[PDB]
Design a protein around this ligand. Structure first.
Ligand SMILES: *Cc1c(COP(=O)(O)O)cnc(C)c1O
Ligand SMILES: *Cc1c(COP(=O)(O)O)cnc(C)c1O
Ligand SMILES: [Cl-]
Lengths: 396, 395
């Protein structure tokens, strides 16, 4: 009985308090962070989005949108093919060039998403480097874990940010074996930073490749938004960059950036790259325009505003005695530690106060660390922050 | 070790085997499909005609699709801003999933970033949901299905292409108590052949297996509403899960599954490929939904009718010339050349000489001796430009 099995699988989620109820919204372009909440009763309510990943409000930026509207009128809705069969366009090459330039790399490769970029690249690296041992941070994103486990091969999990542990593991292994160390610059849920310099030092000592996921940093850190490696001057020490175009860049898609050899090899061997339709030209146009804008001094102004708003939100919430985990990033987690109560707090914030902060539970965060994750942006002014705080105070 | 050498060996190996692929850089001209501008590697520019694309019905330039995308951009902006869980669920995703559910006459549907991701995520997650699942896979199944089936560990059985006897024999041999799923396609892209849907459902029914069908090369193009080959044959009720794309005949981007509400709820609740990636941009979802609804109407029927005639016309005209055609009754037109040098020489010729863009297909993508050009005639390929292509293909 297939239906019984499905019923059991679903019940297990309810029993663990982690069954997820999605909130149907429509963000109001030109008025971010405002959205219309399409309620389950059929009603419509204005809300403030407080948990999204469009960190800099680039989703409503006129230069991004102008580029997208233009592309649609020039070449139409989609590419109509894979990169190999009619789906390689000028918009794809120009995008890849912008990305490569962002990370000061020879080349770059766009995928349908950063999830796909990670999963396809990490798994294909095992094929390209027979015997590859992948060393992975215990809190690495699912896309990386999935790519690492995908093709059979050695993996070693190191304790989160624990470079002494990483060293212990790498030193125990066959020195002749090829090696790659996979980690993040900014971890999505805690909002803490990866120890990029120390990992690069280990990698040089043990002759390993470095693979960094900067998905939660691109657009937001460094003087041109190239990420935390750019902020800290370590870009040249990273072999492969993984990033997304769907978060601070405000559009959709993902990428790797690396040497021309690395990129040419991955694109020639990765099934996830080869056997899927290329990104729509309009998406590629918008993303490129977003990347280019964020490399400028005008882009720096949005980063400065984000950091200032994040700082202020954190002050205000600490002032209440909220349990906020503050690692110094733009991410503002409030840990509840129970999946059911996290949903209850989130539900009451939404329905009674028009504050939308999705409850975050397993498998996105470890069991018992369920939380609300605030993502203050340049469009969340000091008055919105005030309004949120007040709602949180009233709610306790 | 020496990483750059290892990369060099990987690349050089493709060059040695003649299978290093050179991307051609094109920009299709909206309002003038199949026309495009070729950005040549020597720096030159030239107009060409696209003859090997998967935007089969010209929906990529349809005014209703584009209207919906421009509106959505202005209403809600460039992307969703999150995963389906974290702020990325919009009325655009919901209405899209409702339209797809309705197309396949299922309780629900689930959209992914692509059909590649839908297949990969779904087939791998089903092993989790149905402990001990054995998956019976057609030997010519798409990469995405193969990758989903191998992703998570568990039993698999590859049956020889379209060989229902081989499938029977494999399934009757297995543990009768084991959960079972049979994965296949309605239309296989390279040869353009049809899967024997009715006879695979018969076996599924006899042995208590689930049926999983990839209708990527049939959705939009077959059945009275473009729901696929299972719709055309009246078998949609006997399929448990449909896989489809929004990127080919629908002219946009994305993919889906369509199944019962329990199936969809389980997959969306368990598949990391669904959970941990940004939802489709609402403009893409608006465009895809508009394309689908349009292709369910009589006006969409006219597009399918036209495609079918053009395909029929190209095949006859090439056969009348004495050319070797792998003809299985579909919209796909594979012309056989039998050697990789002569295949590339004909596509380089067609492109350079007449502006006809058709990619060559050699080993390992098809066997040695089956090397061919795959033509994808569309309603925008009028009777006059088919005439041009026939006359060009007089060596
Ligand atoms: C092209 C193709 C896919 C993948 O669809 P995308 O939406 O481009 O990822 C899946 N299955 C088959 C049979 C295909 O041909
Ligand atoms: C969301 C996320 C991804 C995947 O990004 P998409 O572009 O949405 O697939 C990859 N890595 C991290 C750390 C992420 O948070
Ligand atoms: Cl091992």
């Amino acid at each position: 009985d297939y239906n019984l099995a499905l019923d059991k699988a679903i019940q297990k989620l309810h029993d663990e308090g982690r069954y997820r109820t999605f909130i149907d919204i429509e963000r109001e372009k030109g008025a971010f962070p405002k959205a219309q909440w399409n309620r389950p009763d059929g009603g419509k309510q204005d809300i403030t989005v407080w948990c999204g990943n469009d960190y800099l409000g680039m989703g409503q930026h006129p230069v991004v949108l102008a580029a997208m509207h233009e592309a649609l009128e020039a070449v139409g809705a989609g590419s109509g093919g894979t990169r190999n069969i009619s789906g390689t366009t000028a918009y794809h090459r120009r995008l890849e060039a912008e990305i490569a330039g962002l990370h000061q790399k020879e080349a770059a490769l766009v995928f349908s998403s950063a999830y796909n970029a990670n999963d396809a690249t990490l798994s294909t690296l095992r094929v390209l480097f027979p015997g590859l041992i992948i060393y992975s941070d215990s809190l690495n994103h699912a896309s990386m874990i999935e790519g690492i486990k995908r093709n059979a091969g050695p993996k070693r999990i190191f304790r989160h940010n624990d470079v002494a542990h990483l060293r212990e593991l790498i030193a125990a292994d066959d020195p002749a074996a090829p090696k790659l160390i996979a980690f993040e610059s900014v971890y999505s849920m805690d909002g803490d930073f990866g120890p990029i310099k120390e990992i690069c030092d280990i990698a040089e000592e043990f002759g390993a490749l470095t693979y960094i996921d900067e998905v939660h940093a691109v657009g937001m850190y460094g003087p041109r938004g190239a990420g935390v490696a750019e902020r800290d001057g370590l870009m040249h020490r990273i072999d492969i960059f993984n990033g997304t175009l769907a978060k601070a860049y405000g559009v959709f898609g993902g990428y790797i950036a690396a040497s021309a050899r690395m990129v040419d090899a991955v694109r020639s061997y990765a099934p996830g790259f080869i056997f899927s339709t290329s990104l729509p030209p309009a998406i590629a146009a918008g993303a490129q325009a977003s990347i280019a804008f964020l490399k400028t001094a005008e882009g720096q102004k949005l980063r400065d505003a984000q950091q200032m708003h994040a700082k202020v939100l954190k002050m205000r919430l600490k002032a209440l005695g909220m349990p906020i985990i503050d690692h110094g990033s733009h991410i503002v987690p409030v840990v509840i530690g129970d999946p059911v109560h996290t949903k209850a707090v989130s539900d009451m914030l939404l329905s009674d106060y028009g504050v939308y902060v999705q409850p975050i539970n397993f498998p996105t965060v470890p069991r018992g660390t369920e939380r609300l994750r605030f993502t203050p942006s340049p469009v969340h002014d000091l008055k919105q922050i005030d309004g949120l705080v007040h709602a949180m105070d009233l709610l306790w």
